[PDB]
Amino acid sequence: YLRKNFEQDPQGREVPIEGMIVLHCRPPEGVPAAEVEWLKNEEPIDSEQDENIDTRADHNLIIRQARLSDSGNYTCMAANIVAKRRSLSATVVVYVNGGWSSWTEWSACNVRCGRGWQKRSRTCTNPAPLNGGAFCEGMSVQKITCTA
Amino acid sequence: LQVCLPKGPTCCSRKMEEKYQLTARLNMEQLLQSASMELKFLIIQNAAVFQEAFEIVVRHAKNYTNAMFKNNYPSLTPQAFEFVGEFFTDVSLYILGSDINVDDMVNELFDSLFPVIYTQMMNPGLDINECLRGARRDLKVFGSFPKLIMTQVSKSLQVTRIFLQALNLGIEVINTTDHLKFSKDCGRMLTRMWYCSYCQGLMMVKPCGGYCNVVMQGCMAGVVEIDKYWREYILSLEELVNDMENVLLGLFSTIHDSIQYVQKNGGKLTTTIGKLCTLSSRRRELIQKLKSFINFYSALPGYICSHSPVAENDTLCWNGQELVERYSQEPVVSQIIDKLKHINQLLRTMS
Ligand SMILES: *[C@@H]1O[C@H](CO)[C@@H](O)[C@H](O)[C@H]1NC(C)=O
Ligand SMILES: *[C@@H]1O[C@H](CO)[C@@H](O)[C@H](O)[C@H]1NC(C)=O
Ligand SMILES: *[C@@H]1O[C@H](CO)[C@@H](O)[C@H](O)[C@H]1NC(C)=O
Ligand SMILES: *[C@H]1O[C@H](CO)[C@@H](O)[C@H](O)[C@@H]1O
């Protein structure tokens, strides 16, 4: 006998580019023991194909770096001699935080005599936000008054 | 010693070998930066200009909407300024990559706009506000205008958002290139090619062109693999440029026509409610200048050898260990390729 209700469905997670995430899965009660298989976007994943992904004896999908295994709808599926059962798909999205760039050089004073301007740019590219990452916090331009 | 193969005696110790290794690191980083500087400054300039230009467009469109409200519907001010400011603030927040729902922007705009229209224009004379907000959507008072604006602005704002993120990620990968750390074996090979001749007492001897070729094709085996994805990135950006200024600037006319449309059925509406309650030039020049750097990753080892001191003739040259008459003969790169694949899929889908 194989049950419909999964003991513990995989949870969707937000993980940075370097973060590591473990997707837990407890198959439903059944004799014999349910064979857990992971499917990324309704397609099976090969643990031997990549060092970053490995399948554990206790049905867990561990990802060390969010680079070698990017976002997707990971779904846990239990197979048995009776039938197969699909768990609730976890929406794993890898999010990249905004990071400030160095202060560029000060521009020349536009006005030759009297009140002038000097600019310094600061772009949000180290690192640039990805897959809806938080944008850089604060100002992007710096302006100072100069007297030539 | 661990780098300089000692064939005879040697004029340098192990610490001088470490100094030569660090100078080799600095020379490689300087050469890569010099190779990448023109492209980096091109993309930085364009990113800055497009960002400021989009912010100027959004500010000017908010200004024009506020001015047309001041001129045509003074009865709706100053509440009109609040919801217009909130709408265009959410517009800018969406452009800069924040999680904003475009349909929700338009729906909150019309939800805030309808009650003041009813109280000041249709039925002159705070607690009943939510009943009006519900009746706005339940009776479809604005007709197809909200969905028209919804699609009109979502289509342009999505392409603009992804354009800015693509420019920023290109800046990111180009900044990574000259900061690409290499293997230790490559460090020792570059130290041998550039400096280990000094340990053998030679003053002006340069390494062989062929030795530079084997060394560079040795440690750039991973970096050259980026070329496919960089080419696909360039071509997908070209696919995307072939839009947001016209839409945001006609928003005021569209809103005015929607207000006229609602006022057109005021007779039935009031009784029922009383009862119930130079940009395109820039992106073209950017793409035409960016296509000149499509060979950037494939021509990079050729650049390093053609800009490093080498004996092109392969005669009386340094082969890494002795003066010869003739020469005999991932992780960070993986991240670059991951982000390029991501941005390329994102680009191609907007097409
Ligand atoms: C994952 O679930 C979402 C729910 O909106 C759906 O849009 C999407 O098609 C699914 N798969 C992928 C590839 O995004
Ligand atoms: C709107 O445009 C007019 C035109 O002169 C200007 O006087 C006014 O300051 C502008 N308002 C805003 C908020 O930009
Ligand atoms: C690369 O980004 C880093 C941020 O720390 C910055 O220090 C550096 O100046 C940038 N690169 C170039 C080549 O200008
Ligand atoms: C950029 O701004 C400051 C450094 O000046 C920090 O709060 C942080 O590292 C941010 O990304």
Numbering used by the authors:
A (entry chain E): 154 to 301
B (entry chain C): 61 to 185, 191 to 307, 314 to 348, 382 to 433, 455 to 476
Q: What do the study's own words say?
A:
Guidance receptors of the Uncoordinated-5 family (Unc5A–D) have emerged as key players in navigating cells and axons (Hong et al., 1999; Leung-Hagesteijn et al., 1992), where they trigger cell-cell repulsion in response to extracellular ligands such as fibronectin leucine-rich repeat transmembrane proteins (FLRT1-3) (Seiradake et al., 2014; Yamagishi et al., 2011) and netrins (Hong et al., 1999). Unc5 receptors consist of two extracellular immunoglobulin domains (Ig1–2), two extracellular thrombospondin-like domains (TSP1–2), a single transmembrane helix, and a C-terminal intracellular supramodule, which contains a ZO-1/Unc5 (ZU5), an Unc5/PIDD/Ankyrin (UPA), and a death domain (DD). In agreement with previous findings (Verschueren et al., 2020), we show that Unc5 receptors directly and functionally interact with the morphogen receptor glypican-3 (GPC3). All glypicans share a similar architecture: a structured N-terminal extracellular core domain, followed by a C-terminal linker region of ∼80 amino acids (Kim et al., 2011).
The complexes crystallized in two different space groups with different crystal packing. Strikingly, all three datasets revealed an octameric assembly. The center of the octamer is formed by four Unc5D molecules that are aligned in a “head-to-tail” antiparallel bundle. Two GPC3 molecules wrap around each end of the Unc5 tetramer. Each GPC3 chain interacts with three Unc5 chains, forming interfaces with the Ig1/Ig2 domains of two Unc5 molecules, and with a TSP1 domain of a third Unc5 molecule. Interface 1 is located at the C lobe of GPC3 and interfaces with the Ig1 and Ig2 domains of Unc5D, burying a surface of ∼690 Å2 (mGPC3 complex) or ∼640 Å2 (hGPC3 complex). The largest interface, 2, is formed between the Unc5D TSP1/Ig2 domains and the M lobe of GPC3, burying ∼1440 Å2 (mGPC3 complex) or ∼1330 Å2 (hGPC3 complex) of protein surface. The buried surface is ∼390 Å2 (mGPC3 complex) or ∼360 Å2 (hGPC3 complex). Within the octameric arrangement, the antiparallel Unc5D chains also form interactions between themselves, especially at the Ig2 domains: the buried surface amounts to ∼900 Å2 and ∼840 Å2 for the major antiparallel packing interactions within the Unc5 bundle.
